[PDB]
Amino acid sequence: MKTFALQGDTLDAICVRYYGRTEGVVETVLAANPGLAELGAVLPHGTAVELPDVQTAPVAETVNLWEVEHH
């Protein structure tokens, strides 16, 4: 279960949008998504980050981001 990160949609936000907290979770996503701890600042729109310890199906949110052809 990974989603494309965007402006104001980094782990700091996602973690709160899915789990609703950063304490204890930021460490998890770090192990599942290595090298992301080097970025620091906001992530580049399109970052593929996986959400560990997450159930199937989408999450409570509103958005219709559709895109399959980028090349």
- DSSP 8-state assignment for residue 16: H
Q: What is the CB-side half-sphere exposure of residue 15 using CA atoms within 13 A?
A: 13
Q: Which two tokens stand for residue 61?
A: 């949110």
Instruction: Tokens 């199906």: give the residue.
Output: 57
Q: How many independent structural domains does the chain possess?
A: 1
Domain span including residue 50 = 1-71
Q: Which residues pair with 67 in a beta bridge?
A: none
